[PDB]
Every structure is written in structure tokens, then in C-alpha cells.
Amino acid sequence: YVVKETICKRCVHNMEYAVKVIDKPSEEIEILLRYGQHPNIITLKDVYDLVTELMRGGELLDKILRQKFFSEREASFVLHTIGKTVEYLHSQGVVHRDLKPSNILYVDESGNPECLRICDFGFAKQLRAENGLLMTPCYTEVLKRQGYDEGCDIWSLGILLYTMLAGYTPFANGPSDTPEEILTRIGSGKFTLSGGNWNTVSETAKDLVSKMLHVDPHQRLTAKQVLQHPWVTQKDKLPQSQLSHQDLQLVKGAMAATYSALNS
Ligand code: NA
């Protein structure tokens, strides 16, 4: 490898790759080695004492809230792509726990949904027995946290969906928002789905967001249940008019602030 400039940093063989250098680690290497093969999970090329595929298309919001023509039809292909990958991960007993939009990148500058990749597994954990051998939800405190952590991966896709639809985040108005104001909004379980831009959004889209962001995490939807919703299944039925959106930096800043509030 011929180590080049930082974006963690790019390299060569003769082809270009990315390298994520970490300070003193094992759970991420294991998830990437057993599941990296998935088209929409970043492929691990090598591990030394980690080499991955170089993402050349930037983060999701950067494309969808800028150049790319973006309507409900396009938003549906994004949720499906990511929803299917998350459904696959949950079936294998893998929870992500950092499924914020900045961890969803494009391999190329095409904006094609197939090019989407979930890129960071540093917060990800595998459901283990105790010995511990790997366990899936299929073979039934550890199981209760997994259920809670699955619902947190769905909630995160819920805020992604909301952002894609509204062109703003459900619980933060900008980077200036404090944990106090964001945490109060989350805890209330209330969010706008009416007025202005929301008035031209489909009733099916509003139905899914409500079900994904539901106050009661028990009345919330599973990854399998999201993908079976008409908004995802019935693509022909969706509006194809450009979705309105706020300034990109403002939206990105609102997301960073939201996750900063949650991680605290
Ligand atoms: Na892959």
C-alpha cells in the first residue's frame, strides 16, 4: 500500500482504496468479515495490526438535498436499499447503533440507490449467547437490549425518512439547537406532519413516518414491517415531483446536534 491524503485515509495496491486507522476494534472487524459481502455494507479488503472500498460519492443528504432529482419515488428506493440491508443485519443478530445519515455513503458520483453503503460499524454489536456463540433472533437482559437496540435502528431510519420527505430533521432546527431542546422534543414523541411542504406529501409517506417514529417503541415497526408498507412496495403510486428542502449545512448541523444529544 502507498498511503495517500485523508478524506480515514486513501491508499493504493494497482488500485485505490480507503484505510480506517484506529487508536488503542474486534467486533467491527468480525461484522465486516462475516457481512461485508452484502452489496450495501462497505466491503472489507484487508485487516492489519483496516482496508475498505473507497467511497467517491459523499454522504447521502449531500447528494439527495442538492444535485440529484429527488421526489418520493427516489426517497423510496433509498429507504428500501438501506431498510433491506438493516433487515438482513437484524436477522443475523447485528444491531448498528449509529445509523445516522453521515454513515450512509455513495460509492460513485452516480446517485444510483444500488451505490448506497452503510459505512461505520464501530458502534455495532452481535447478539451472543455468553460463551459466547453468535445468536440470531430466530433462536429466541441481552435479548431485551437487542429489542431496544433494533427499535433504535428503525427510529434512526425514521428520522432519515422524515428528513428526506421534509427537507429538515424532525427534532432539530439547526446546529445551534441544544440537548435540552432536542431531548424535550424527542421525549414528547410529537413532530410536524402538516402545513406547507407536508401538505403536498402522500398520506402513505406520513403513515410510515408516524409508525417509524411512534412514541411507544412497542407500536413501532420492525425492519421487515417497514419494507412491507405500501410506501416501499407500491412505487408506481408515489408522487414524482421534486421535494422541497432547507439549506444542506443547516440540515447536516441539525442531524449532528440530534445525535450529539442522543449520545449524551
Ligand atoms: Na459489500
Curated annotation (Swiss-Prot):
GO cellular component: cytoplasm; cytosol; nucleoplasm; synapse
Chief site of localization: nucleus
Binding-site list for ATP: K20
Superkingdom per UniProt: Eukaryota
Function: Serine/threonine-protein kinase that acts downstream of ERK (MAPK1/ERK2 and MAPK3/ERK1) signaling and mediates mitogenic and stress-induced activation of the transcription factors CREB1, ETV1/ER81 and NR4A1/NUR77, regulates translation through RPS6 and EIF4B phosphorylation, and mediates cellular proliferation, survival, and differentiation by modulating mTOR signaling and repressing pro-apoptotic function of BAD and DAPK1. In fibroblast, is required for EGF-stimulated phosphorylation of CREB1, which results in the subsequent transcriptional activation of several immediate-early genes. (Microbial infection) Promotes the late transcription and translation of viral lytic genes during Kaposi's sarcoma-associated herpesvirus/HHV-8 infection, when constitutively activated.
Family: Belongs to the protein kinase superfamily. AGC Ser/Thr protein kinase family. S6 kinase subfamily.
This protein's name: Ribosomal protein S6 kinase alpha-1
